[PDB]
């Protein structure tokens, strides 16, 4: 298997592959099902209406007391049930309020100046010295090497398409401490202005007009654990990867700053990761709505960093995902909430949670979120059943690579089974080896 | 290999009745007799500020290390930018202050604990007390948390620092370096790890230590003493910090307590030897079968019942007896060519244990000179096996190497 060959074979000519029409407007982040008032509240198993994640907490507690690893899924014993939720909770250690979405708060600072690392290194002046490299070719190789050190399994570069940057972010006022954060969330516009550096005022989050590029990282989840979806070990690989995302953003932003440029971290905030990942060539959009990659299918998390560092954009990739999703529909048939459409792509949002004006499969994300308190987790059944999540999809016919169409026709064993560092799989880890030739052309 | 070379139970570190616990302030990094070193202009400064001055001089002169020309100034800058960034999740080079910043001895105030409070995992008594099942659970968690190697030992208090270097609890970060103080670490009959005005208190119930190996990148370490060796060192310190926090939270959410440490609290090499990760060596590092000495260590202390691993003997002592390659290549002649003794060469060694006694002030003195963290000893050690070619060459996630990553695969059989 040769993952670099595969990406070269399916590379497209330059240009955003996302098809849009005149109804396209930037999307206010509060509209996501996690944050919008219509979807935020969900009943728990006693019928009490609560913030969805508190209702899900109630189900986790109920499952542990009943020796279960998920909905109607008996564990080996209560201790095993406990252990899965302890692993899940611990995975979130470096993530604020399920996704790090507040810009320029906590780990997501838009300047490095107050960070303990920046203060310690201040005598060297790396963040104040003008860049010594302005060549986009060399910078792309340097920043991608740094990205791999920082924990990305995939990395790509695109020009920043502002259509996918949230029109307004969900955040908290700068004087609000963490313990009041969930009670004091506000909206704040993200605007683009002729300023030298990213800056936040009382009224606006201001991205400079010089912010040309977005660097997108893929953070691979663990296949054995995700295949337990919707049960607790799928929750644990999800959670650990959010902390890996946070570390990636902070590491990479510091590298970029110490190279003489500015950098904006984001994790789940600032803009729509799937669209950036498609434009940076990590993969293609899919029926479930995730970015499907050749190496991991959709079983990969995304984060991204915005910067004025000159870079060479990667080419988008077309390995036939759209045509497979047209005929496959496994995620839609297996979805426990029937949130995923079995119909064609349109430009018309299904509800407030979708951004209208771009051609995509339109899914009902209030239905999806509704299953999370019911199951006490983050589901993931769609990722688990997608044939691209299997490690065995690619075959070579003597001339070229192709997808094997035959692919489209318990938790105790996970705890007792194969694992390796960060949940990566040495049987496939060669797929993400990188040399200069595949970092920049 | 690890099963083939398992020893019977029992600490393999030979001691005499002279041995006493070692005050952390005695390390060359911290002690007043070794802390101040001249820069290249002759100005005496804290040694790491003099090393900063050399990094700046090298960038200006288009160098990646001492008398090592870079491809250009841009390349020199990029190596130091990568090094500085690697340290993002590490306080003041090593996270040594206990119960400060990332190294909290309780999870109660952490943002993650607060968010998860309604589930009550940290307040609920353990549902598992079987050390066999716990050892399998916690080692699985350790691999998720970024350890390439993990082992368990009973806690030997001889390797716990008698007094830690820390700061007063209300001193802000901007004043930390100027207000470092000593503070005793003591063991008492208390329910939970607790810090008073006077003492860091570890419970007498704190039976076990979990030791993690965090693998460095071979291509980058082989550029020692130049900048890319500094970068793999730095990134692994941030990996250490995330490992400690992740694992401590897992242990707490299982109903036990956990003390993180990174480079603080105690001597990692001794813990790693007792937990079976590897053997002590002439250079002083723990040499592992998978990585040689090219691996960083961190550790977590806990009352969670666990099954101790066996120490390992794969012949490092006898190999180091005749090798002496690190000693001949050491740019500061810090590593001895003589035999092992129980007598330290200076304040920086803990006397009373059989080891190769090295002069660690000589080692530190080379760091301002070279503008880095050296590492030549690690780079040349047989067990471990230009900068433009590294930047243009092979890399993979976290610097791990897919040619060898199968060596750290793990199933239950090898976890307990
Ligand atoms: O983006 C996410 C937000 C959440 F609240 C979750 F629980 C989760 F697993 C992912
Ligand atoms: O343990 C370390 C301490 C330091 F100050 C360094 F710069 C490096 C490693
Ligand atoms: O000479 C000292 C060095 C240190 F690191 C201290 F913690 C201290 F109190 C005295
Ligand atoms: S399961 Fe099938 S339809 Fe759904 S995303 Fe995967 S390939 Fe597309
Ligand atoms: S996460 Fe679960 S409920 Fe949501 S779309 Fe996927 S399968 Fe459906
Ligand atoms: S780090 Fe360098 S100076 Fe220090 S002991 Fe090793 S070779 Fe010698
Ligand atoms: S270089 Fe030789 S003597 Fe030194 S630590 Fe390695 S094997 Fe031992």
What region, left, alpha or beta, does residue A129 occupy, with left being phi > 0 and alpha being psi -120 to 50 degrees?
Answer: beta
Q: Cα–chain-centroid distance for residue B158?
A: 17
d(CA A410, CA A387): 19
Q: Which tokens hold the place of A56?
A: 């899900």
Closest chain A residue to the Cα of B246, Cα to Cα = A90
> Ligand 5 centre and the CA of A229: distance in Å?
10
CB-CB contact of B214 with B295 (8 Å): yes
Task: Identify the closest residue of chain B to A433 by CA–CA distance.
Answer: B396
Name the domain count of chain B. 1
* Alpha carbon A319 to its chain's center: 21
Gyration radius (Cα) of chain A, Å: 21
B25 CB near ligand 3 (under 6 Å): yes
A102 in ligand 4 pocket by Cβ < 6 Å? no
**DSSP 8-class letter at B296:** E
CA nearest to B110 within chain A: A93
Q: Is A381 in the pocket of ligand 5 (CB under 6 A)?
A: yes
Tally A–B CB contacts below 8 A: 250
- Which of B96, B305, B397, B403 best probes binding to A when mutated, by most A CB atoms within 10 angstroms? B397
- Which residues span the domain enclosing B41? 1-416
Nearest CB among A60, A124, A131 relative to B56 is that of A124
**Distance, CA of B387 to CA of B339 (rounded, Å):** 36
How far is B349 from B326, CA to CA, in rounded Å? 19
Nearest protein CA to atom 4 of ligand 2, as residue: B93
Per DSSP, A396 falls in state: E
- Helix or strand run (H / E) with residue A233: helix A232-258
Dihedral sign, CA of A165, A168, A173, A177?
Answer: negative
Residue A65 contacts residue B233 (beta carbons within 8 Å): no
How far apart are alpha carbons B380 and B16 in whole angstroms? 32
Give Cβ neighbours of residue A117 (< 8 Å, ≥ 6 apart): A254, B84, B85, B87, B88, B89, B90
- The answer to whether A425 touches B410, Cβ cutoff 8 Å, is no
Ligand 6: lining residues by beta carbon, under 6 Å: B 330-332, 334-335, 363, 366, 374-377
Ligand nearest to the CA of A303: 1
Interface probe for A, chosen from B63, B71, B88 (most Cβ of A below 10 Å), is B88
Closest CA to B85 of A259, A215, A254: A254
Residues paired with residue A49 on neighbouring β-strands, in sequence order: A43
Spatial neighbors of B63 by CB under 8 A, at least 6 apart, are B69, B70, B76
Question: How far is it, in rounded angstroms, from Cα B274 to Cα B64?
Answer: 38
User: What is the rounded CA–CA span in Å between residue B332 and residue A88?
Assistant: 48
DSSP reduced 3-state for B184: strand
Q: How far away, in angstroms, is A373 Cα from ligand 5 center?
A: 12
Distance B107 CA to ligand 1 centre (A): 21
Give the contacts of A161 (CB within 8 A, at least 6 positions apart): A16, A18, A275, A276, A279
Taking CB atoms and an 8 Å limit, are A133 and B78 in contact across chains?
yes
Rounded CA gap, A429 and A424, in Å?
A: 7
Residues of B in contact with A427 (CB under 8 A): 406
Q: How far apart are CA A304 and CA A160, in angstroms?
A: 11
Q: How far is the CA of B337 from the centre of ligand 7 (A)?
A: 10
Experimental method: X-ray
Closest residue to B128, CB basis, from A54, A82, A179 = A82
Q: Which two tokens stand for residue A144?
A: 């991608």
Cβ distance A79 to B147 less than 8 Å, yes or no, reads no
Residue contact A145–B242, C-beta within 8 A: no
Report how far ligand 4's centroid is from the alpha carbon of A374 (Å): 24
Q: Bridge-partner residues for B332, per DSSP?
A: none
DSSP secondary structure letters along A61-119: HHHHHTTEEETTEE-SSHHHHHHHHHHHHHHTTT-STTT--STTSTT--S-STTSHHHH
Residue B342, phi-psi category: left (phi > 0), alpha (psi -120 to 50), beta (remainder) = alpha
Can you tell me whether residue B309 is helix, strand or coil? coil
CB-CB contact of A157 with A140 (8 Å): yes
Interface test with B, best of A86, A91, A232 (most B CBs within 10 A): A86
Which contacts qualify for A200-204: CB closer than 8 Å, 24 or more apart?
A200/A103, A200/A104, A200/A110, A200/A174
Angle between helices A232-258 and B73-86 (to 10 degrees): 140
Q: Give which of B229, B238, B220 is closest to B367, Cα–Cα.
A: B229
Residue of B nearest to A437 (CA): B392
Residue located nearest, by CA, to atom 8 of ligand 4: A325
The residue to mutate among A229, A287, A320, having the most atoms of ligand 4 within 8 angstroms of its beta carbon, is A287
Question: How many beta carbons lie within 10 A of that of residue A343, not counting itself?
Answer: 10
Q: Does ligand 5 lie within 6 Å of residue A332's CB atom?
A: no
Specify the ligand 1 atom closest to the Cα of A99: 1
Distance (Å, whole) CA A123 – CA A126: 8
Q: Whose CA is nearest to atom 5 of ligand 2?
A: B93
Q: Which residues is B181 bridged to in the sheet?
A: B166
- Which 3 state secondary structure label does DSSP give B259? strand
Least Cα separation, residue B206 to chain A (angstroms): 20
- Residue A420 has its nearest CB partner, among B90, B141, B405, at B405
> Where is A234: in which H helix or E strand?
helix A232-258
Which residue from A124, A418, A424 is facing B84, i.e. has the nearest CB? Answer: A124
Nearest CA in chain B to A112: B88
Maximum Cα interatomic distance, chain B, rounded to a whole number of Å: 62
Resolution in A: 1.6
């Amino acid at each position: 298997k040769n993952a670099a060959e595969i990406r070269q074979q399916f590379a497209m000519t330059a240009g955003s592959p996302i098809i849009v029409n005149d109804k396209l407007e930037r999307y206010a982040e509060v509209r996501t099902a996690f944050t919008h008032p219509t979807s935020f509240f969900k009943p728990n198993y006693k019928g009490e209406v609560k913030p969805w994640f508190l209702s899900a907490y109630d189900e986790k507690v109920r499952q542990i007391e009943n020796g279960e690893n998920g909905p109607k899924m008996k564990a080996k014993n209560v201790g095993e049930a406990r252990a899965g939720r302890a692993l899940e909770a611990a995975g979130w250690t470096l993530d604020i309020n399920y996704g790090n979405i507040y810009p320029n708060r906590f780990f997501m600072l838009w300047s490095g100046e107050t960070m303990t690392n920046t203060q310690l290194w201040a005598p060297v002046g790396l963040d104040r010295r003008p860049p010594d490299t302005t060549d986009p070719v060399e910078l792309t190789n340097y920043v991608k090497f740094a990205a791999r050190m920082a924990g990305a399994d995939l990395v790509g570069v695109a020009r920043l398409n502002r259509n996918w940057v949230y029109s307004e972010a969900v955040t908290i006022p700068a004087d609000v401490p963490y313990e009041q954060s969930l009670h004091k969330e506000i909206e704040k516009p993200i605007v683009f202005k002729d300023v030298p550096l990213p800056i936040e005022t009382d009224d606006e989050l201001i991205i400079p007009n010089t912010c040309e590029n977005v660097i997108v990282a893929g953070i691979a989840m663990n296949r054995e654990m995700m295949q337990t979806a919707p049960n607790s070990m799928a929750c644990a690989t999800t959670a650990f990867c959010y902390s890996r995302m946070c570390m990636f953003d902070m590491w990479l932003c510091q590298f970029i700053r110490y190279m003489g440029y500015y950098a904006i971290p984001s994790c789940n905030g600032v803009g729509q990761s799937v669209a950036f990942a498609v434009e940076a060539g990590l993969g293609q959009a899919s029926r479930m709505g995730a970015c499907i990659t050749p190496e991991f299918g959709p079983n990969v998390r995304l984060t991204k960093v915005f910067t004025n560092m000159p870079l060479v954009p990667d080419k988008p990739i077309d390995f036939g995902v759209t045509e497979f999703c047209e005929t496959c529909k496994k995620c839609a048939r297996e979805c426990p909430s029937k949130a995923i459409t079995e119909g064609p792509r349109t430009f018309e949002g299904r509800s407030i949670h979708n951004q209208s004006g771009k051609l995509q499969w339109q899914n009902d994300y209030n239905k999806c979120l509704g299953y999370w308190p019911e199951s006490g987790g983050y589901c993931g059944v769609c990722v688990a059943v997608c044939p691209f999540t299997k490690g065995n999809i690619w075959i070579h016919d003597g001339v070229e690579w192709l997808i094997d169409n035959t692919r489209f026709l318990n938790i105790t064993e996970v705890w007792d089974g194969k694992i390796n560092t960060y949940g990566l799989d040495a049987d496939h880890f060669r797929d993400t080896v990188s040399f200069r030739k595949d970092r920049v052309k």
